Amino acid sequence: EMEKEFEQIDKSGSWAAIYQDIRHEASDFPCRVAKLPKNKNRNRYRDVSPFDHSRIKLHQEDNDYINASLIKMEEAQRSYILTQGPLPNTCGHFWEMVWEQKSRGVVMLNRVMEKGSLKCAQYWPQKEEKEMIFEDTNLKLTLISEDIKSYYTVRQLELENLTTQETREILHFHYATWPDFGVPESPASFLNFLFKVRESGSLSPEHGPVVVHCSAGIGRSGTFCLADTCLLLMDKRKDPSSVDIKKVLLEMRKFRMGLIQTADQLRFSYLAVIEGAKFIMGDSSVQDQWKELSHEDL
Numbered sequence: 001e002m003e004k005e006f007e008q009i010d011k012s013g014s015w016a017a018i019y020q021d022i023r024h025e026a027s028d029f030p031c032r033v034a035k036l037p038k039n040k041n042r043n044r045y046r047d048v049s050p051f052d053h054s055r056i057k058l059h060q061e062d063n064d065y066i067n068a069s070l071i072k073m074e075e076a077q078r079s080y081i082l083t084q085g086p087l088p089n090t091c092g093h094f095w096e097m098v099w100e101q102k103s104r105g106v107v108m109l110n111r112v113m114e115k116g117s118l119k120c121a122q123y124w125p126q127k128e129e130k131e132m133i134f135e136d137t138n139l140k141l142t143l144i145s146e147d148i149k150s151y152y153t154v155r156q157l158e159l160e161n162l163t164t165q166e167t168r169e170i171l172h173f174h175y176a177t178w179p180d181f182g183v184p185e186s187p188a189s190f191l192n193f194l195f196k197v198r199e200s201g202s203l204s205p206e207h208g209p210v211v212v213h214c215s216a217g218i219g220r221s222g223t224f225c226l227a228d229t230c231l232l233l234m235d236k237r238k239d240p241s242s243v244d245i246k247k248v249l250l251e252m253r254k255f256r257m258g259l260i261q262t263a264d265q266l267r268f269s270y271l272a273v274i275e276g277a278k279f280i281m282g283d284s285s286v287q288d289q290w291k292e293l294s295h296e297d298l
């Protein structure tokens with residue numbers, strides 16, 4: 001039915017109008033804390049802020065602000081934290097948030113440099129022997145191993161609370177070939193990456209919410225979460241026709257502004273959910289076809 005609607009929209013060439021309708025209906029809640037003068041240098045983009053009601057609060061008396069929202073999908077029973085690419089002065093806040101929220105995975109959908117500009121601080125160590133200490137939040141971060149594929153890398157990190165010496169394993173899923181304001185190369189390569197995150201346990205309810213970010217934390221991040229939530233919803237009663245993609249995105253936009261930034265990203269979301277429904281509906285072989293079609297080797 002999403003498939004019926006998909007074709008009816010393609011036929012009439014009206015993705016822009018559909019997408020603008022979602023823009024017009026989306027929630028509008030206050031972001032008063034994000035706009036305090038003291039938080040000016042904690043925001044990467046003037047027009048991308050967390051709503052107060054859903055923002056993540058750091059557990060520090062000084063300044064609890066970080067540009068991060070909790071997307072709590074009640075019916076699907078999955079939460080995500082969406083956040084901007086950490087700034088040079090907010091890398092400590094970012095890992096503090098990971099620690100306090102008990103996150104087991106970080107999904108990064110951007111590169112540090114995109115189209116000639118620095119979109120994200122280098123907030124994790126690229127070399128085992130060069131670990132990072134964030135003095136402001138008393139955390140230590142060490143690269144343990146990397147699994148490098150053609151278009152994405154998985155990193156095993158060890159995060160240590162220096163105050164208590166507890167250590168945690170964090171999995172880092174880094175999508176290297178998803179252009180800003182763009183789409184993945186194929187449904188297959190997006191779904192292949194999504195299922196790699198699923199298979200790591202990082203999305204289990206035994207863990208804190210997965211942290212998803214790109215540069216702004218709304219476009220690519222929104223696309224990733226919408227696809228995942230829609231597949232989970234349809235997985236609950238094995239009923240693809242019960243999933244209203246636009247309704248789900250609107251429900252997500254109650255927790256963070258601007259989720260999915262272009263009409264083609266919306267269109268891609270439909271493609272990914274439609275293709276992923278094959279797996280949800282009992283065809284497990286399709287998962288290996290995605291791995292093949294994604295060309296992840298070399």
Ligand code: VO4
Nearest residue numbers: 215216218219220
């Ligand atoms: O860095 V994003 O523009 O895909 O929110």
